[PDB]
Design a protein around this nucleic acid. Structure first.
Ligand code: 6BX
Ligand code: MG
Ligand code: MG
Ligand code: MG
Ligand code: MG
Ligand code: MG
Ligand code: NA
Length: 756
DNA sequence: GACCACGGCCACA
DNA sequence: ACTGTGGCCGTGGTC
């Protein structure tokens, strides 16, 4: 199984290294054949000789074009001839390229900014994480001495915890009687022992939580102060750093550094992304927190160091189990995109589709379009219409059913050959014309995007079939991971066509797909009402909820099935509508907000404040309880009863303060904010106090009893003393709980005053 | 100073 | 920064 690729220079020539794991043995394949290149388009093939005589400078050594090759490729589905410019070293082409681009006889250069090892994986048709080879894993965490006002890593590393299949153990340079504690003399011996543990375990993946921005940087700073060689790589190298926009990420050559923070932030949405919070969310069991204050005090007084070690052991044991749950899926994503698990676990979704598309484009001899320049980016600042959300039939409905279009947008793209290369193509014999936008799509030849999406969705159906037949639960889940990810990728390819930074950006294709989908949904609505007698309560973009006014439950189900068959025949191509489920009752507040209950009793809430992270748990809990009473038993009397009980508890200040915390995120440099609301105000004060509030910082504030601007009255919950503070129950009643439960109970006549 | 437009944050598809 | 559609609220601007 391929794990990663990179390249090392040797006598000036590049050498690709393929880190594999075959038959349970770590192997390194060396290739000295691959040559760096990019494509260039000339007004006249004549100037190729003048293009051969181009110069530049790197490391005091002039860089020249090695050779040229005339290659014929298809750009935008159209034939074109292009010169392939070869170079001696990969780093030569980050130079020269701007010089070539500015040459008079060149039009543009293509596939220039492509990583050499990535280009190898693509051009060689190599797929990471392919095989039944199980991987050895090891999760490590650190515990450091923190003193305020000091620089980074001024204090020492107190403990180094690691966890694997055998268990969790902590290495520390002080005496603790905990059985999982190995005691050493100095921080140097602690680090040294950790490297020995890694070296002897030869781990394939190293699981860290936020290790890309802390654990490895702290370990590096200490290994430089104490004069250690942090040779954690299988090639005998130290963890290398690579920039990732504002922040950085660390690689362990010959291994895969799996930082769980970016993966978990992307996959799950929670109010706060603390390790303890992530654990109790994914596994249901709480994890105790020991703050740096307690840690430093315990180390300096030598008292209660056992508890600090327990935190370290857990911090690692949970990191392993979390990684064990999130690695197989991310490995299958790596298999799908054709890039290393390291890169896919840290890259944005819009960048993953670029890797996938560039692989496919190489498979189809399609010259990959470049990225948008600044002027075209502004030219791409255009807006098009999207889905059709109907003003919901607000209130409570009974015996209802949701019908959805399976992969609506992808089905449209394939059915009508929707793609930038099949748009207004002069000289075709078959054209499908897009509603409202009037864009003509050639169907004589299948398009790039439709071909990819077609092959993809074909695989997903195949994958689901093998899954339902597969007997190993592991293998099954692997297949289940692929089918879900295939669906995400397909719909993401549509977003690429609308992404300004995307290389295959066709606004026409986007608005055409939206228009088609609007049409298909509208007709379905008209037919299910006029021809079959239903009332559409709500519809967003790819489906709708509906029922027959005063209908028997089983009647709705049966009559619903009939409309599916009727509409599917009238539905062109693979555009199908399907029966997601039946719900006894459901409340619809407004667009993008509702909740329904299955016949078993499971409630699905969407958009309602119960799912929001920027809302007090007391409001979310209360709104949920109201929703349960109504959607389960209709005890509206109990619902208002619950509201009154909660409001009285808040009046008497008997509600746990943790349920009154509002979690909001800083999305930019506080310097550039233009509306200092409560959360950015709290952080701005924290900023002056010393704390660095950066993009992504989650602020957790509470409102203390007082008056005036909400901002100049909120404190971070880490600064809340129940003995010295009192929360503004009025705010948490007249601005949190009531303004949410009212929106639901307004349908039944109750007003805020009627709720105490 | 009462009312309202509105950054700004998050959610659904 | 997938995109688009959408609902909120604390805050200040505005007569
Ligand atoms: O049945 S509900 O839960 O009311 C609505 C969902 O089925 C809608 N889907 C669309 C596809 O992505 C997941 C959500
Ligand atoms: Mg390029
Ligand atoms: Mg190519
Ligand atoms: Mg047209
Ligand atoms: Mg195409
Ligand atoms: Mg059909
Ligand atoms: Na792209």
């Amino acid at each position: 199984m391929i794990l990663d690729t990179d390249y090392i220079t040797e006598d000036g020539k590049p050498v690709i290294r393929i880190f594999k794991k075959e038959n349970g043995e770590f192997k390194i394949e060396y290739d000295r054949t691959f040559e760096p290149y990019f494509y260039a388009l000339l007004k006249d093939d004549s100037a190729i000789e003048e293009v051969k005589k181009i110069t530049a400078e790197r490391h005091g050594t002039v860089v020249t074009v090695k050779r040229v090759e005339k290659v014929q490729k298809k750009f935008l589905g159209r034939p074109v001839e292009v010169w392939k410019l070869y170079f001696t070293h990969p780093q030569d082409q980050p130079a020269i390229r701007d010089k070539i681009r500015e040459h008079p006889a060149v039009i543009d250069i293509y596939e220039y900014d492509t990583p050499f090892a990535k280009r190898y994986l693509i051009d060689k048709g190599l797929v990471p994480m392919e095989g039944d080879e199980e991987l050895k894993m090891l999760a490590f965490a650190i515990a450091t001495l923190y003193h305020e006002g000091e620089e980074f890593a001024e204090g020492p590393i107190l403990m180094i915890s690691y966890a694997d299949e055998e268990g969790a153990r902590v290495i520390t340079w002080k005496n603790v009687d905990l059985p999982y504690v190995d005691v050493v003399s100095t921080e140097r011996e602690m680090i040294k022992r950790f490297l020995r543990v890694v070296k002897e375990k030869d781990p394939d993946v190293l699981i860290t939580y936020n290790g890309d921005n802390f654990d490895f940087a702290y370990l590096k700073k200490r290994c430089e102060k104490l004069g250690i060689n942090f040779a954690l790589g299988r090639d005998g190298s130290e963890p290398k750093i690579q920039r990732m926009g504002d922040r950085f990420a660390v690689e362990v050559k010959g291994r895969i550094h799996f930082d769980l923070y970016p993966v978990i932030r992307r996959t799950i949405n929670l109010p706060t992304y603390t390790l303890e919070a992530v654990y109790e969310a994914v596994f249901g069991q709480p994890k105790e927190k020991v703050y740096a204050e307690e840690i430093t005090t315990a180390w300096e007084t030598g008292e209660n160091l056992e508890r600090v070690a327990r935190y370290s052991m857990e911090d690692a044991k949970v990191t392993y189990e979390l990684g064990k749950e999130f690695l197989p899926m991310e490995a299958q994503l790596s298999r799908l995109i054709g890039q290393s698990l390291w890169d896919v676990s840290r890259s944005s979704t819009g960048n993953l589709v670029e890797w996938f598309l560039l692989r496919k484009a190489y498979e189809r001899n399609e010259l990959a379009p470049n990225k948008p320049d600044e002027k075209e980016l502004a030219r791409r600042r255009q807006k098009y219409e999207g889905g059709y959300v109907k003003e919901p039939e607000r209130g409570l409905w009974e015996n209802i059913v949701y019908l959805d279009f399976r992969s609506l947008y992808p089905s449209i793209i394939i059915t009508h050959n929707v793609s930038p290369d099949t748009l207004n193509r002069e000289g075709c014999g078959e054209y499908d014309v897009a509603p409202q936008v009037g864009h003509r799509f050639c169907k004589d030849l299948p398009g790039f995007i439709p071909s990819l999406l077609g092959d993809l969705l074909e695989e997903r159906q195949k994958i689901k079939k093998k899954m339902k037949a597969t007997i190993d639960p592991i293998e099954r889940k692997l297949l289940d991971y692929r089918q879900r990810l295939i669906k995400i990728l397909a719909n993401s390819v549509y977003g690429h066509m609308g992404f300004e930074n995307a290389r295959w950006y066709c606004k026409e294709c986007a608005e055409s797909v939206t228009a088609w989908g609007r049409e298909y949904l509208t007709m379905t609505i008209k037919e299910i009402e006029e021809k079959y007698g239903f009332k559409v309560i709500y519809s967003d973009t790819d489906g709708f909820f509906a029922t027959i006014p005063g209908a028997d439950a089983e009647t709705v189900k049966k009559k619903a099935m009939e409309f599916l068959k009727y509409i599917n025949a009238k539905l062109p191509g693979a555009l199908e509508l399907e029966y997601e489920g039946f719900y006894k009752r459901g409340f619809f507040v407004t667009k993008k907000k509702y909740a329904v209950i299955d016949e078993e009793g499971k409630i699905t809430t969407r958009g309602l404040e119960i799912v929001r992270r920027d809302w007090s748990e007391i409001a979310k809990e209360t709104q949920a309880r109201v929703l349960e009473a109504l959607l389960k038993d209709g005890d509206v009397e109990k619902a208002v009863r619950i509201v009154k009980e909660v409001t009285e508890k808040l009046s008497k200040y008997e509600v746990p303060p943790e349920k009154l915390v509002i979690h909001k995120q800083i999305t930019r440099d506080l310097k550039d904010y233009k509306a200092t609301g409560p959360h950015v105000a709290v952080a701005k004060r924290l900023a002056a106090r010393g704390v660095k509030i950066r993009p992504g910082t989650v602020i957790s504030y509470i409102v203390l009893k007082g008056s005036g601007r909400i901002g100049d009255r909120a404190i971070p919950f880490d600064e809340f003393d129940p003995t010295k503070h009192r929360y503004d129950a009025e705010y948490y009643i007249e601005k949190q709980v009531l303004p949410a439960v009212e929106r639901i109970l307004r349908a039944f006549g109750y007003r805020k005053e009627d709720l105490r």
